[PDB]
Symmetry: C3
Subunit: 452 residues, 3 copies
Amino acid sequence: QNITEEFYQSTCSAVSRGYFSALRTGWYTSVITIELSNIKETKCNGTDTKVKLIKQELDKYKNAVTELQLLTQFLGFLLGVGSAIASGIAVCKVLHLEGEVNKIKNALLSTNKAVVSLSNGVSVLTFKVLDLKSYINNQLLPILNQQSCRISNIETVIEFQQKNSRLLEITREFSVNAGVTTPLSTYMLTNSELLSLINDMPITNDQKKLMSSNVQIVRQQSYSIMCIIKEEVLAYVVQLPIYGVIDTPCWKLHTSPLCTTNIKEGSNICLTRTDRGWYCDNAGSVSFFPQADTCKVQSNRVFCDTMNSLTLPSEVSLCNTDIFNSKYDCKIMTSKTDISSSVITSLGAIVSCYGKTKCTASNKNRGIIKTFSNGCDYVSNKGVDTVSVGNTLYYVNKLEGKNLYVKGEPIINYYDPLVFPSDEFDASISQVNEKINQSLAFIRRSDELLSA
Amino acid sequence: NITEEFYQSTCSAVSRGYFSALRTGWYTSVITIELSNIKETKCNGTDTKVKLIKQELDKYKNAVTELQLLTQFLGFLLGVGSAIASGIAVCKVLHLEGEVNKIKNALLSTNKAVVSLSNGVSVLTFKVLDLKSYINNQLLPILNQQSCRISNIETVIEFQQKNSRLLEITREFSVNAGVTTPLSTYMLTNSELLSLINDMPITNDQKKLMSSNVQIVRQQSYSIMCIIKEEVLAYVVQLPIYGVIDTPCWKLHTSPLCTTNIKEGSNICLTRTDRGWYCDNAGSVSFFPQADTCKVQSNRVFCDTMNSLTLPSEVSLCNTDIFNSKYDCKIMTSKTDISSSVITSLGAIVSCYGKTKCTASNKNRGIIKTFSNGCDYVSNKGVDTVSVGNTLYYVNKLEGKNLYVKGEPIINYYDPLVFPSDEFDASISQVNEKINQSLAFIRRSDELLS
Amino acid sequence: QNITEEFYQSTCSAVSRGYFSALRTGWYTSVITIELSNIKETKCNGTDTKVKLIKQELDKYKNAVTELQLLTQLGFLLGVGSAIASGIAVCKVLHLEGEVNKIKNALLSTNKAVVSLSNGVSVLTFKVLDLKSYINNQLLPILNQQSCRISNIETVIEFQQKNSRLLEITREFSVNAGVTTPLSTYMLTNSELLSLINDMPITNDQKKLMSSNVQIVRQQSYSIMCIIKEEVLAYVVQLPIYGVIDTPCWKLHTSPLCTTNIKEGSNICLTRTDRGWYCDNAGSVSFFPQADTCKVQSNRVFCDTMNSLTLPSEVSLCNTDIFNSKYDCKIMTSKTDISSSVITSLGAIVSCYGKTKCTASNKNRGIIKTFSNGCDYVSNKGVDTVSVGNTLYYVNKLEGKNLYVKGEPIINYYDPLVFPSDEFDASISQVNEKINQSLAFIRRSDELL
């Protein structure tokens, strides 16, 4: 669908509107199990190319079992810290409780899908993915038993190593990630299992369809937690996201440093909005995600994690149209560092050009089409493919969409130098103002002293 | 058995009772694979079997050449290190003339040897795969007999299985610039690691700890590719050495502490910047600021001293007395009245300000606590979930004793309009003197009035 | 490989000179294709041991194919980029109706072709694996003739290897949301990469660099999966282009500098904030503040210009004259009197303060020098290890020329009580005006009494 971007020359910022939300508000926990069989010994005394292949494969299996038993014994800093897998670990604590795994085992004996009531009070979906027990006991061992371990068919060796392959890779991922893997691999959960788990979760059909349409993102926001291998069953807990907020209006704010352009080399003053990031409407409030890469965009849907969010009033949006509005204190940073740089937006690029820096926008068939004068400016991605700032060449996003240039006098011109508080990092419109008011009284007080 | 303490005065939490396992040094070991380089594949007869062994042979012949090509808050004060300077030094010695022969000849009869390098250093060496003796005496003879027509498909399957470990090791190096971390199981199997652990020059206390938590050891290890020369492939495994064990370790969590005034803009905030891990070590405290630099297993904290500063034991007074005259407690200031929550080991700190809705809930009963404006704390026993605005936080489910220590929030001791509200790495005494310097200009400017 | 390091005691900073540049200035995009054949359904019955392996192998192929159709729908002052804006632009062209057909028709006769896309870009296209003609004319006839009884095991093993690369590429794309980095060997083999290196519009000197350090190339590349339609699978590979090579490049290490006075809590600190890599580029200096954004091989520094700022050449004066009147050297101020050490390319910087024990030791001799309070530096020649408090730092063992440049510590030139001690990204000139404004208020107030 159409995406609309607005550029504000007054504040040297850009807002990309039209995106839709898909916020991860919670976690759903599922128990994934594989059935194992304890092999005491292979009494295979006859050795040949086939026996050594099946035996070494068996050694890899018994070694994987042993390995797991050992395993089982701007802004952004203002966000709140969480425990990503605190939910899954809680399930581990119950599965570690006496006789709890057996309850799961009895439910998964006849079918591969069951809801089990855990001892605490929680009903959880349980899933038997691989049945290695019944394979090793009644498909492999009889062939071995019948011909006294001289296996006539090479096919058994090829197939057996394939059935064991999934187990060895699951072990590797857990063994290299300290029992916690992310994203959820295809070895962790096959697509057929994942889609079926999506289909069986207690959520709306709108949510089921969303997760099934973007199974790739679901995988990336999930965890796999190794849990327990006891009583002929190994089980790990998969922790899937649940998206409670879908299809709410959402927009992205891009900002770039705004500096004065004076003839004197070192006497310039800068101002930068620090409220950059994604903003989604939610239940009368606004979820603000300061960290840039906390969200992944697919078409028009933004898949985000609320864990990296702040909850702000709806009045936050006024900072885009009126940064000095009297209802929300817009967050800004100050500097005297007039360094040229560029900000690539969704439908264009912001260019803050200062000093003698070379700033250029180019078309692939046309070359340079615009040379930026000093100040903060903006260009649409329509006729433009490339942007050049200094020695850094930026490629622009090539997404068709509506652009809007909002004229205005740069806010940095509204402050008188020499009285500018030039070392504020997480300040605001009013916060800088009062520090100015404190500096102007200190100047009156020093001049009132020169008077005598 | 971990005890947590919450200080309402400073809106912080301290979890006491953890034990240490600090990586104080590095041990370097040389892991080798003996290879034989195939001169040429002259298979002239074409068949589905010949094409299978030839491509399998080519993949091996490619890995050797491929690897051979490869062979030619706070925190800002933390000193910078060189993680693999130890491994790089060991690599550099193996490159010396006639040095590989010393390595090769020692591992010719056994798979474990201590080799004295020309400089002076004895290193543990390990021959894991002997592909040379496989290729020369079992595979190459089979191939030559019928001009590459293998009657038993088992041979190609055995070769591809025998060849698998080499190719997988190559692939990790091929995507990670010759330096892998954590240490994969293809680099060093669990069986080899415990055996290499058992042979390291450490206490039995150190061996048992590492052997019981080989998973964490893997995450703090490096694999450094070095050389393929004279039909021998070798890479250096750099394992951590835990010189400091079982000393006390505690965690300090911090969250912004602001006033809760009815007036929209007149609130002031204060936050302790000393968040992180604290372990006693040699009479001092080892401080690790960033959360993800340490990994916890049960009651032990595995950390790397390279990401630490060394602080006096008096740092602990900031938890019990932020105004103590023996250590200058580190603080940041703001006027940013933002609500947020920090999940502790045994609970959650909740900073609730403005019109934000802050709630603590249980899974079986729903909402159980409604937070009033200010910084407060709830234990994880009867509480399962914590919600701050649009953010749903799950709490840790670890049983343990908690302690709510009443005290007046420190932010109330300050009068606004005179509060310096832009300090990032300042301290109680730094803020005090900055007010004292502003009040001296306040006293003296009115005193000069006549 | 001759590297010279200079340590400046006045400013507690170190410059490692002699390194050369290799800046990623542009992007090259190539489209790699695999020809597929979609089976309506394998209508073979799944029971016997021979059928179950080939039939299951066929299902793993058909599921990976189906999966792809589902999927196919300092430092803070830096500027933000779009890393794959170039690659996404190319992929977007392939989604237009009937656009893929131009690709297919060109790669019918050769495995390498330059195709005219309908929109605007000419891209190299590459058919690596041909699964179509194998499935259509070698496997399925063998399978169909004997009613899924594959009597000869050799055919199925060849298939699973021929099928392997697709599943591995599919598996990687399935874990990285269609965008992978670094570029794996399943994405692009060395044989393919070196041949693709040879066709890029660069000089032979640039070509030779990329082929000699193919490992770094992989780490600065992306693979973008985007389309599987009309019996063709294609993804865009985005390789770096190093337009600026062999320019002088140097690394600046800095460590906090505090006074060493007897009073425990009364101390003042100062730190140069302009740490990072500096390479000459187009008469200016390309500055990389982030340390791990560059990878070092011998004397070549592979960096990405996208995370860099462009600075005037006068930046180098901050190493030689921190008070120079031509460039405003960046510094931070504090009262956080904490001891620490900085490992350089050819040695170690040690900021030793308070009652901390600071020591540099040799492996064969033990402790050789005990550091007094202040910021100091020792060469990697006679020194093997350095210890500060409970933190053990290993020094790099690279031979190279070192230079201890004596000078009075800059922190001593300032009188406390007028020192602005909470500046995070301030400068020489910024501190001076704040001192003069506070000292003029002290001059005029005391001159009145």
